[PDB]
Amino acid sequence: EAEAKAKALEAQYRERERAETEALLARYRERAEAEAKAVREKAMARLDEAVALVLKEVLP
Amino acid sequence: SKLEAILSQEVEAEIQALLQEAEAKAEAVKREAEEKAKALLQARERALEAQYRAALRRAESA
């Protein structure tokens, strides 16, 4: 029964581990998509300026 | 008669000594188990938790 009880632990140990680690991914990924967007968004506004600047070096 | 009475007198206390030895021999079997079962299961609790958390941690590292 010291083996048995521990067997009963194991289930949960794999399950809870699975469920959470798998869940952690959801949280990260779906936040990754978002955070990726937010550096795009910072640029969007002040973006034009970049083109303008870059264009200016190349032009003469 | 009394002669064989001494033969009696010898046996009865021995019956009790078989028992006293015996009593200790059941109890010890019982107690060998008590510590052993408790002590492995602790280790297997331990082990299972760590073998979980460090994965989730490493997952956090992802």
CA distances from A40 to A8, A37, B40 (A): 49, 5, 55
Experimental method: cryo-EM
CA distances from B8 to A10, B12, B14, B15, B54 (A): 60, 7, 10, 11, 71
Which H or E element spans position B13? helix B2-60
- Tokens linked to A41: 């968004």
User: Which DSSP symbol is given to A47?
Assistant: S
Contacts of A25 in chain B (CB under 8 A): 59, 62
Longest dimension (CA), chain A: 86
CB pairs under 8 A between A and B: 38
Nearest CA-CA partner of B47 in A6, A22, A5, A18? A6
Instruction: Give me the amino acid identity at B7.
Output: L
CA distances from B35 to A10, A18, B7, B30 (A): 22, 33, 44, 9
The CA distance from A15 to A8, in Å, is 11
User: Which DSSP symbol is given to B62?
Assistant: -
The residues near A52 (Cβ < 8 Å, ≥ 6 apart) are none
Q: Is B1 helix (H, G, I), strand (E, B) or coil?
A: coil
Angle at B22 between CA B20 and CA B24, to 5 degrees: 75
Annotated binding site of A for Ca(2+): 57
User: Would you state the CATH architecture of domain B1-62?
Assistant: Up-down Bundle (1.20)
**Domain residue ranges in chain B:** 1-62
